Amino acid sequence: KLFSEKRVELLKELSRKPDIYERLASALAPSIYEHEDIKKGILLQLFGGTRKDFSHTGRGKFRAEINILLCGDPGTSKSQLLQYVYNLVPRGQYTSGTAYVMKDPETRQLVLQTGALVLSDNGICCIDEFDKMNESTRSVLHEVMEQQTLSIAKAGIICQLNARTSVLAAANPIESQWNPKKTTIENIQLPHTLLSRFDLIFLMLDPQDEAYDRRLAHHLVALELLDMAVLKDYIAYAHSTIMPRLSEEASQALIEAYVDMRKIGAYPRQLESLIRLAEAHAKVRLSNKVEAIDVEEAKRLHREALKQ
Amino acid sequence: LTREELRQIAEEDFYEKLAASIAPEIYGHEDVKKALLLLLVGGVDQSPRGMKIRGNINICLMGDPGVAKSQLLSYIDRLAPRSQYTTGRGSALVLADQGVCCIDEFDKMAEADRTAIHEVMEQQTILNARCSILAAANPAYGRYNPRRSLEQNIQLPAALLSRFDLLWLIQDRPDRDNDLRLAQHITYVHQHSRQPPSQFEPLDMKLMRRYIAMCREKQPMVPESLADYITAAYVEMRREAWASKDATYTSARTLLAILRLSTALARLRMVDVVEKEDVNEAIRLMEMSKDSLRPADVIFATVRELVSGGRSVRFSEAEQRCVSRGFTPAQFQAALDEYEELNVWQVNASRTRITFV
């Protein structure tokens, strides 16, 4: 519709390159250095999953959109990356650490106003300083993170709202320094529910390695165009046109992956997130079927995040 | 300007004269004067690869009451072309765009305004707020306690202090000779209605304003040769700050601050290329700001270099290597005898091999 035949041909030519995934990872945020896995996760979130309706099953509409949590020291690439995502992604939202009722001056009737979360429906909402936010708001987040809906019962006003949004949150550890400990709660002090709801959790640690400081300083003092402009339309085309579906080999692989993963401790929600990640990677290759490569890559990324 | 006036600025030690010309009525504190001069000059603004960097210099001065901070703020308000002087309760940021915002009693303000101050500090925007913030603070108890931590004595968040590129602490330390000197200078100022006679008479306010205006017009370019030295110095400073738990968090903001200081110094000296002298002066200023808060051995080492996996070393090889280092054979024999008395090794009488004990 919005693309000529030559644009579709160019998209197919780029997709036929096996290196398109890593090339696009290199294309995302050129000013950010040696965070390839984070860029991969951001790209997978941008692709997201595929929407499925379970009306015949009697089950509620399952979430099919990916959320990622980031934790680290302030002054790092959090704010710049969040601004980059907010500017690049259309309908993006930037917030710092909901719906409300307004009087109609004409009819004296109480009308409703939509917050940034509702206004960013089908978009991406990014939040800075997640730790420094009030517990009242984070309690509300459980509903939007899980059911993608929002219910209000106040002053006789009862309503339900659609909140199809992806949350990209940045948080600061309570010690303001990576104290040598075991669980992420021991450094960040977050409840198990919120952490379990996040599909991907990444930690930004400034290593005490001299060569890393040399590379950082050289990147700063020394501080592509063909990719992002085409990529916006490419992501739109992938979202509108293709949708992947699961296969039997991926079924067996995911079953074995789950039974192995629980031995490490694992909840079914991470299995749902793995299915979503496999769908996203299938969308990356513009493949209509989920194969072994998607499952292997998703499991590799999840295990790398857990190891880190 | 008239170029003759610029020459009248450009005598020997012109940097010292310019530094002393700012608030000469207050004796000493030349480092704070230099910091204010660099704030008046300011760094360079660039927007490379999609991100905007700041060149504005924001300085926070905290000290016990009675150290003449308010008079410094009034003087810098007078001297700056675009300057806005405001108090904590009495409040402006937009009005001081492309200028200096002088605010005092920063520690005596609610945190709600402090929260909005962070965005202005980080992005110079609110509308645009491209201004140099000069904040004044006081200790909570009226006296600075070195026993207590800096953040507790300032009762401000660590991030807010980090966003200030320069921190200067002034303590009213009682020294008899310094007290007498300050008293006599103050008496001369009172009686004569003029500053005490220094080595060089300070320049006029209009001349200094014009000179700052012209020096701001230039945009020096950082050479790539000095990058390696800057990287090494930043690594050393960050390692020192990592070893000390009470030091401020030296993130990339410190590197940005020292780069801004170097660019401001380059503008001050009227050169389109930043030299290593500017980097050295910036490092010295940052260090001062953070501080306010025998042939025998050589020959033994030379023969030690020939112990790469062997217990015995040939006499001829060691003799040749020691002479090549610039030592006569007499000194080689003297060193051999001296370390031989300690019985570190034994020499064969054939003077062909030495077995190291």
XYZ file of C-alpha atoms in Angstrom:
665
model
C 0.000 0.000 0.000
C 2.515 2.590 1.211
C 5.454 0.814 -0.476
C 6.313 0.626 -4.154
C 7.472 -2.625 -5.735
C 11.101 -1.466 -5.708
C 10.947 -0.960 -1.933
C 9.632 -4.506 -1.443
C 12.370 -5.832 -3.731
C 15.025 -3.966 -1.732
C 13.569 -5.315 1.522
C 13.719 -8.864 0.148
C 17.294 -8.314 -1.061
C 18.336 -7.120 2.399
C 16.499 -9.988 4.116
C 18.237 -12.560 1.904
C 21.487 -11.455 3.556
C 22.199 -13.823 6.483
C 23.996 -10.938 8.234
C 20.993 -8.569 8.185
C 20.230 -9.265 11.857
C 23.724 -8.382 13.089
C 23.968 -5.530 10.572
C 20.752 -4.003 11.942
C 22.086 -4.525 15.466
C 25.132 -2.498 14.412
C 22.802 0.094 12.860
C 20.839 0.667 16.081
C 22.318 3.492 18.191
C 25.691 4.040 16.463
C 26.872 6.232 19.358
C 26.493 3.279 21.777
C 29.427 0.860 21.899
C 29.759 -2.848 22.754
C 26.125 -3.451 23.723
C 25.244 -5.735 20.823
C 23.040 -8.051 22.903
C 21.056 -5.069 24.208
C 20.518 -3.821 20.646
C 19.438 -7.342 19.659
C 16.880 -7.349 22.467
C 15.644 -3.891 21.473
C 15.217 -5.022 17.862
C 13.345 -8.149 18.975
C 11.057 -5.993 21.126
C 10.456 -3.703 18.137
C 9.428 -6.722 16.071
C 7.503 -8.153 19.018
C 5.251 -11.175 18.782
C 2.133 -11.967 16.781
C -1.394 -11.305 18.009
C -3.645 -14.319 18.585
C -7.325 -14.360 19.558
C -8.405 -17.081 22.001
C -12.146 -16.343 21.931
C -13.006 -19.925 20.941
C -11.001 -21.295 23.888
C -12.708 -19.181 26.552
C -9.318 -17.771 27.576
C -8.464 -14.101 27.845
C -6.444 -12.318 25.186
C -2.861 -13.291 25.994
C -0.149 -10.641 25.947
C 1.979 -10.749 22.787
C 4.207 -7.694 23.354
C 7.695 -7.774 24.867
C 8.882 -5.818 27.919
C 12.531 -5.309 28.898
C 14.022 -4.071 32.182
C 17.414 -2.363 32.477
C 19.354 -1.809 35.705
C 22.670 -0.081 36.295
C 24.457 3.025 37.467
C 23.050 6.451 36.541
C 24.818 8.494 33.900
C 25.284 5.409 31.708
C 23.611 4.862 28.321
C 20.143 4.606 29.977
C 18.884 8.127 29.267
C 20.466 8.380 25.810
C 19.116 4.977 24.744
C 15.649 5.798 26.088
C 15.639 9.115 24.217
C 16.836 7.353 21.053
C 14.041 4.776 21.297
C 11.426 7.438 22.074
C 12.480 9.583 19.106
C 12.919 6.717 16.629
C 9.760 4.744 17.431
C 6.520 6.443 16.339
C 3.910 6.862 19.082
C 6.650 6.381 21.673
C 6.325 7.787 25.179
C 8.949 9.025 27.642
C 8.124 9.307 31.345
C 10.026 9.960 34.566
C 9.548 8.488 38.024
C -2.824 7.089 34.457
C -6.418 7.886 33.533
C -8.147 10.650 35.474
C -11.625 12.153 35.793
C -12.447 15.660 34.552
C -15.560 17.783 35.017
C -17.394 18.880 31.899
C -18.014 22.614 32.508
C -21.036 22.467 30.181
C -23.096 19.519 31.465
C -21.464 19.203 34.931
C -20.678 15.592 33.976
C -17.510 13.732 34.953
C -15.559 12.796 31.833
C -12.378 10.719 31.620
C -8.924 11.800 30.457
C -6.407 9.294 29.101
C -2.916 9.177 30.566
C 0.325 8.746 28.670
C 0.069 4.963 29.055
C -3.353 4.911 27.383
C -2.284 7.483 24.780
C 0.667 5.205 23.925
C -1.606 2.255 23.100
C -0.012 0.011 20.453
C 3.142 2.056 21.105
C 6.228 1.895 23.310
C 6.436 3.567 26.729
C 9.841 4.102 28.350
C 10.395 4.981 32.016
C 13.509 6.269 33.787
C 14.404 5.643 37.443
C 12.029 2.737 38.009
C 13.334 2.157 41.544
C 12.590 5.756 42.592
C 8.865 5.427 41.771
C 6.056 5.272 44.323
C 4.734 1.849 45.302
C 1.163 2.914 44.484
C 1.966 3.251 40.777
C 4.037 0.054 40.673
C 1.085 -1.818 42.188
C -1.058 -0.583 39.289
C 1.626 -1.754 36.842
C 0.932 -5.422 37.640
C -2.425 -5.279 35.855
C -1.143 -3.517 32.722
C 1.956 -5.741 32.596
C -0.137 -8.927 32.815
C -3.619 -8.504 31.312
C -2.876 -5.490 29.047
C -6.110 -4.036 30.493
C -6.912 -1.565 33.257
C -9.935 -1.444 35.574
C -10.997 1.537 37.705
C -13.621 1.503 40.481
C -13.680 4.929 42.148
C -16.509 7.342 43.011
C -18.978 5.084 41.218
C -16.967 5.171 37.974
C -16.398 1.641 36.646
C -14.507 1.245 33.379
C -12.083 -1.026 31.545
C -9.354 0.268 29.242
C -7.095 -1.316 26.645
C -3.405 -0.753 27.416
C -1.473 -2.530 24.661
C 1.948 -1.040 25.459
C 5.533 -2.241 25.822
C 7.444 -1.117 28.912
C 11.170 -0.329 28.682
C 12.226 0.570 32.222
C 15.497 1.856 33.668
C 16.328 1.291 37.330
C 19.088 2.174 39.779
C 20.396 -0.304 42.385
C 19.704 0.724 45.967
C 23.415 0.703 46.855
C 24.236 2.909 43.820
C 27.036 0.349 43.380
C 27.121 -3.352 42.499
C 27.591 -4.840 45.953
C 28.864 -8.441 45.664
C 25.706 -10.456 46.336
C 23.595 -13.235 44.809
C 20.069 -12.155 43.827
C 19.169 -9.012 41.903
C 16.763 -8.109 44.721
C 19.717 -7.899 47.116
C 21.010 -5.007 44.974
C 17.812 -3.445 43.579
C 15.130 -4.509 46.095
C 12.277 -5.325 43.728
C 9.382 -7.735 44.384
C 9.365 -11.143 42.723
C 6.094 -10.406 40.902
C 7.375 -7.409 38.925
C 10.654 -9.147 38.061
C 8.810 -12.288 36.935
C 6.530 -10.205 34.705
C 9.508 -8.773 32.797
C 10.407 -10.809 29.720
C 14.042 -9.640 29.586
C 16.157 -8.169 32.391
C 19.568 -6.694 31.574
C 22.185 -5.270 33.940
C 24.610 -2.467 33.041
C 27.877 -2.987 34.934
C 30.877 -0.741 34.319
C 33.779 -3.221 34.279
C 37.048 -2.406 36.025
C 39.072 -3.190 32.894
C 41.586 -0.668 31.572
C 41.076 -1.534 27.896
C 37.335 -0.927 28.241
C 38.038 2.578 29.560
C 40.429 3.185 26.656
C 37.759 2.142 24.147
C 35.117 4.270 25.891
C 37.357 7.348 25.871
C 38.338 6.833 22.221
C 34.663 6.445 21.301
C 33.827 9.676 23.136
C 36.656 11.707 21.588
C 35.966 10.300 18.103
C 32.212 10.910 18.482
C 24.655 3.664 8.707
C 22.365 6.427 7.447
C 21.069 4.008 4.798
C 19.760 1.712 7.547
C 17.396 3.455 9.995
C 15.261 5.283 7.413
C 14.740 2.025 5.518
C 14.335 0.180 8.838
C 11.312 2.195 9.961
C 9.414 1.220 6.806
C 10.835 -2.320 7.000
C 9.511 -2.758 10.550
C 6.145 -1.365 9.452
C 6.055 -3.832 6.541
C 7.008 -6.762 8.780
C 4.334 -5.805 11.317
C 1.605 -5.397 8.693
C 2.379 -8.300 6.348
C 3.911 -11.383 7.983
C 2.994 -13.353 11.082
C 4.918 -16.486 12.132
C 3.455 -19.704 13.493
C 4.936 -22.474 15.610
C 6.188 -25.843 14.334
C 6.647 -29.343 15.753
C 10.453 -29.271 15.908
C 10.258 -25.981 17.804
C 7.599 -27.627 19.989
C 9.978 -30.412 21.032
C 12.860 -27.958 21.443
C 10.803 -25.677 23.700
C 9.530 -28.596 25.797
C 13.089 -29.821 26.363
C 14.204 -26.245 27.043
C 11.559 -25.807 29.753
C 12.274 -29.131 31.447
C 15.988 -28.261 31.473
C 15.387 -24.676 32.638
C 13.383 -25.660 35.707
C 16.274 -27.897 36.796
C 18.407 -24.761 37.247
C 16.113 -23.353 39.939
C 11.354 -21.169 36.394
C 7.730 -20.236 35.675
C 5.508 -20.836 32.623
C 5.521 -17.073 31.987
C 9.171 -17.246 30.916
C 8.142 -20.041 28.546
C 5.520 -17.679 27.105
C 8.233 -15.025 26.774
C 10.434 -17.560 24.967
C 7.596 -18.268 22.528
C 7.246 -14.515 21.966
C 11.005 -14.174 21.402
C 10.941 -17.045 18.903
C 8.119 -15.282 17.053
C 10.151 -12.059 17.054
C 13.240 -13.784 15.646
C 11.074 -15.458 13.000
C 9.803 -11.987 12.087
C 13.438 -10.852 11.854
C 14.142 -13.360 9.072
C 10.733 -12.596 7.486
C 9.975 -16.312 7.855
C 6.339 -17.378 8.178
C 7.284 -20.469 10.229
C 9.203 -20.752 13.495
C 12.194 -23.069 13.090
C 15.083 -24.406 15.171
C 17.191 -21.273 14.645
C 14.685 -18.995 16.397
C 14.352 -21.285 19.424
C 18.117 -21.771 19.698
C 18.769 -18.023 19.477
C 16.072 -17.208 22.045
C 17.388 -19.843 24.460
C 20.949 -18.593 23.926
C 19.951 -14.994 24.659
C 17.955 -15.965 27.755
C 20.820 -18.095 29.089
C 23.309 -15.295 28.368
C 21.131 -12.825 30.277
C 20.817 -15.262 33.190
C 24.584 -15.856 33.228
C 25.269 -12.109 33.247
C 37.500 46.080 21.154
C 40.174 48.495 20.085
C 43.172 46.225 19.561
C 45.305 48.475 21.779
C 43.031 47.598 24.709
C 43.455 43.900 23.895
C 47.219 44.459 24.010
C 46.708 46.236 27.348
C 45.143 42.943 28.427
C 47.918 40.796 26.898
C 50.955 41.664 29.041
C 52.980 39.010 30.847
C 51.112 36.850 33.377
C 47.858 38.094 31.833
C 46.005 35.030 33.136
C 46.914 35.904 36.733
C 45.920 39.551 36.248
C 42.565 38.537 34.756
C 41.949 36.064 37.590
C 42.789 38.652 40.255
C 40.720 41.328 38.489
C 37.533 39.415 39.368
C 36.460 40.519 42.858
C 39.830 41.966 43.974
C 38.252 43.295 47.187
C 38.218 39.759 48.654
C 41.739 38.610 49.486
C 42.914 35.223 48.261
C 40.700 32.517 46.768
C 42.466 32.760 43.408
C 41.321 29.242 42.475
C 37.657 30.214 42.852
C 38.410 33.349 40.824
C 39.890 31.207 38.040
C 36.849 28.921 38.156
C 34.524 31.925 37.836
C 36.645 33.288 34.976
C 36.366 29.972 33.126
C 32.614 29.963 33.802
C 32.482 33.432 32.237
C 34.417 32.130 29.226
C 32.681 28.759 29.020
C 33.274 25.726 26.846
C 32.102 24.847 23.352
C 28.749 23.424 22.262
C 28.665 20.551 19.768
C 26.001 18.184 18.425
C 27.915 15.152 17.107
C 26.143 12.032 15.808
C 22.650 12.933 17.000
C 23.436 13.917 20.604
C 23.934 17.424 21.989
C 26.789 18.144 24.397
C 27.001 21.079 26.794
C 29.744 23.673 27.066
C 28.230 25.583 29.964
C 30.202 25.485 33.220
C 28.101 25.031 36.365
C 29.897 25.606 39.674
C 28.581 24.995 43.196
C 30.307 26.885 46.019
C 29.573 25.779 49.588
C 31.115 27.059 52.798
C 30.431 28.280 56.295
C 28.486 31.566 56.459
C 30.698 34.637 56.446
C 33.163 33.560 53.737
C 31.947 36.344 51.387
C 29.995 34.144 48.975
C 27.164 36.666 48.571
C 29.574 39.460 47.625
C 31.151 37.182 45.006
C 27.681 36.410 43.643
C 26.812 40.115 43.489
C 30.089 40.921 41.721
C 29.624 38.159 39.141
C 26.023 39.313 38.637
C 27.321 42.825 37.946
C 30.127 41.703 35.630
C 28.265 39.100 33.572
C 26.465 40.558 30.520
C 23.345 38.401 30.968
C 23.069 37.611 34.676
C 20.116 36.760 36.923
C 20.607 36.931 40.697
C 17.937 35.116 42.715
C 17.471 33.505 46.121
C 15.978 30.220 47.260
C 12.679 31.456 48.675
C 12.605 34.458 46.337
C 12.117 32.184 43.327
C 14.358 33.315 36.023
C 16.147 30.437 34.301
C 14.715 31.415 30.908
C 15.515 35.094 31.513
C 19.215 34.193 31.877
C 19.481 32.310 28.574
C 22.997 32.485 27.100
C 24.118 33.988 30.407
C 24.802 33.174 34.055
C 22.175 32.286 36.673
C 23.459 33.222 40.137
C 21.433 31.504 42.870
C 22.184 31.475 46.603
C 20.716 29.566 49.552
C 20.446 26.497 47.331
C 20.496 24.305 50.451
C 17.522 26.333 51.774
C 15.085 25.312 49.019
C 12.447 22.601 48.769
C 13.250 19.438 46.828
C 10.322 19.977 44.435
C 12.174 22.766 42.621
C 15.389 20.730 42.907
C 13.735 17.973 40.859
C 13.073 20.375 37.976
C 16.619 21.749 38.290
C 17.994 18.358 37.180
C 16.500 18.628 33.684
C 17.908 22.146 33.277
C 21.339 20.926 34.383
C 21.313 17.848 32.135
C 19.827 19.235 28.905
C 19.798 23.061 29.260
C 16.079 22.924 28.416
C 12.805 23.364 30.277
C 11.965 26.113 26.189
C 15.751 26.499 26.165
C 17.698 27.141 29.379
C 21.239 27.394 27.982
C 22.680 29.072 31.066
C 25.602 28.695 33.457
C 24.288 27.798 36.918
C 26.231 29.165 39.900
C 24.759 27.808 43.136
C 25.644 28.686 46.728
C 25.089 26.329 49.657
C 25.736 26.271 53.399
C 26.322 23.485 55.935
C 23.275 22.191 57.778
C 24.632 22.992 61.254
C 26.231 26.302 60.239
C 29.716 24.752 60.359
C 31.194 22.227 57.952
C 31.995 18.979 59.750
C 34.792 16.981 58.063
C 33.741 13.973 60.157
C 30.389 13.819 58.362
C 30.218 12.827 54.711
C 30.021 15.467 51.993
C 26.466 14.562 50.963
C 25.205 14.743 54.555
C 26.948 18.094 55.076
C 25.324 19.361 51.849
C 21.956 17.540 52.348
C 21.654 17.259 48.555
C 21.543 14.146 46.352
C 24.801 12.797 44.967
C 23.529 13.036 41.382
C 22.847 16.768 41.746
C 26.376 17.368 43.052
C 27.810 15.225 40.247
C 25.971 17.313 37.644
C 27.928 20.317 38.948
C 31.218 20.179 37.052
C 33.156 22.047 39.770
C 32.863 21.941 43.567
C 34.811 24.367 45.773
C 34.846 24.128 49.573
C 35.866 27.153 51.653
C 36.296 26.625 55.398
C 36.843 29.395 57.958
C 40.021 27.846 59.325
C 41.460 30.019 62.139
C 45.041 31.036 61.353
C 46.638 33.898 63.275
C 48.793 35.312 60.466
C 46.031 34.885 57.878
C 43.553 36.536 60.249
C 45.881 39.512 60.742
C 46.429 39.851 56.985
C 42.689 39.696 56.296
C 41.996 42.217 59.064
C 44.574 44.712 57.799
C 43.339 44.388 54.204
C 39.745 44.909 55.375
C 40.775 47.998 57.357
C 42.542 49.440 54.305
C 39.446 48.755 52.183
C 37.225 50.498 54.746
C 39.443 53.553 55.235
C 40.560 54.178 51.650
C 37.341 52.969 49.935
C 39.706 51.144 47.559
C 41.458 47.809 47.248
C 44.896 47.342 48.815
C 47.717 48.059 46.351
C 48.499 44.807 44.544
C 51.200 44.135 41.945
C 48.944 45.108 39.019
C 45.833 47.278 38.996
C 42.761 45.273 37.914
C 41.165 45.915 34.543
C 37.909 47.815 34.138
C 34.585 45.979 34.129
C 33.696 47.085 30.588
C 37.086 45.967 29.259
C 36.741 42.547 30.903
C 33.189 42.165 29.576
C 34.313 42.994 26.038
C 37.295 40.630 26.285
C 35.036 37.797 27.471
C 32.632 38.578 24.623
C 35.412 38.315 22.032
C 36.958 35.167 23.525
C 33.522 33.512 23.446
C 33.358 34.085 19.674
C 36.073 31.503 18.948
C 35.500 27.745 18.651
C 38.778 25.870 19.204
C 39.105 22.373 17.753
C 40.571 19.609 19.922
C 43.600 17.963 18.266
C 43.734 14.182 18.088
C 47.319 14.048 19.395
C 46.317 15.042 22.940
C 43.537 12.433 23.126
C 45.880 9.681 24.343
C 47.255 11.836 27.165
C 43.702 12.849 28.089
C 42.672 9.181 28.141
C 45.598 8.243 30.393
C 44.935 11.150 32.763
C 41.231 10.295 32.966
C 42.077 6.647 33.670
C 44.460 7.691 36.452
C 41.903 10.042 38.014
C 39.097 7.478 37.800
C 41.333 4.790 39.315
C 42.144 7.149 42.192
C 38.438 7.918 42.654
C 37.675 4.183 42.606
C 40.293 3.489 45.281
C 38.780 6.203 47.515
C 35.219 5.484 48.632
C 34.537 9.093 49.684
C 35.411 10.521 46.254
C 32.678 11.703 43.907
C 31.525 9.282 41.214
C 33.797 9.994 38.228
C 31.532 9.081 35.326
C 31.886 10.401 31.770
C 30.565 13.723 33.106
C 34.007 14.373 34.616
C 35.616 13.857 31.200
C 33.058 16.214 29.660
C 33.823 18.773 32.378
C 37.590 18.635 31.845
C 37.092 18.880 28.073
C 34.912 21.956 28.632
C 37.611 23.419 30.884
C 40.247 22.840 28.195
C 38.056 24.454 25.527
C 37.360 27.426 27.811
C 41.092 27.843 28.436
C 41.734 27.684 24.684
C 39.126 30.407 24.154
C 40.764 32.454 26.920
C 44.203 32.242 25.288
C 42.681 32.996 21.840
C 43.886 29.884 20.008
C 41.881 27.737 17.590
C 43.680 24.558 18.756
C 43.646 23.281 22.339
C 47.171 22.660 23.625
C 48.467 20.426 26.403
C 48.876 23.457 28.681
C 45.087 23.831 28.782
C 44.704 20.141 29.664
C 47.319 20.461 32.414
C 45.604 23.551 33.836
C 42.212 21.812 33.760
C 43.657 18.774 35.553
C 45.316 21.048 38.123
C 42.063 22.937 38.729
C 40.059 19.716 39.091
C 42.642 18.294 41.504
C 42.546 21.488 43.575
C 38.735 21.422 43.621
C 38.663 17.796 44.777
C 41.437 18.489 47.307
C 39.348 21.267 48.879
C 36.866 18.573 49.967
C 74.054 3.504 43.001
C 75.958 1.602 40.300
C 75.748 -1.525 42.472
C 71.947 -1.670 42.259
C 71.941 -0.938 38.519
C 74.512 -3.664 37.833
C 72.580 -6.095 40.045
C 69.442 -5.365 38.017
C 71.411 -5.753 34.773
C 72.699 -9.190 35.775
C 69.229 -9.982 37.149
C 67.913 -9.513 33.603
C 70.087 -12.497 32.583
C 68.369 -14.863 35.045
C 65.778 -15.902 32.462
C 65.518 -19.528 33.572
C 69.138 -20.141 34.559
C 71.006 -20.324 37.845
C 74.464 -19.607 36.381
C 75.326 -16.646 34.148
C 78.386 -16.304 31.930
C 80.893 -13.669 33.009
C 81.567 -12.381 29.485
C 77.904 -11.772 28.623
C 77.213 -9.885 31.857
C 80.430 -7.882 31.460
C 79.506 -6.896 27.900
C 75.933 -5.982 28.853
C 77.001 -3.895 31.860
C 79.573 -1.950 29.826
C 76.964 -1.298 27.125
C 74.822 0.388 29.803
C 77.528 3.004 30.418
C 79.499 1.558 33.340
C 83.244 1.001 33.478
C 84.538 -2.509 34.284
C 85.922 -1.170 37.576
C 82.409 -0.285 38.743
C 81.201 -3.678 37.497
C 83.844 -5.411 39.622
C 83.010 -3.197 42.609
C 79.298 -4.024 42.325
C 80.084 -7.725 41.895
C 82.206 -7.662 45.054
C 79.604 -5.671 47.024
C 76.721 -8.020 46.201
C 79.161 -10.929 46.567
C 79.831 -9.980 50.200
C 76.103 -10.399 50.886
C 76.650 -13.892 49.401
C 73.756 -13.507 46.962
C 75.958 -15.503 44.545
C 79.437 -17.020 44.120
C 81.911 -16.233 41.322
C 84.282 -18.814 39.837
C 87.963 -17.803 40.179
C 88.371 -18.388 36.445
C 86.029 -15.379 36.131
C 84.028 -17.289 33.506
C 80.796 -18.273 35.294
C 78.808 -17.022 38.281
C 76.515 -19.384 40.189
C 73.708 -17.513 41.910
C 73.186 -18.731 45.449
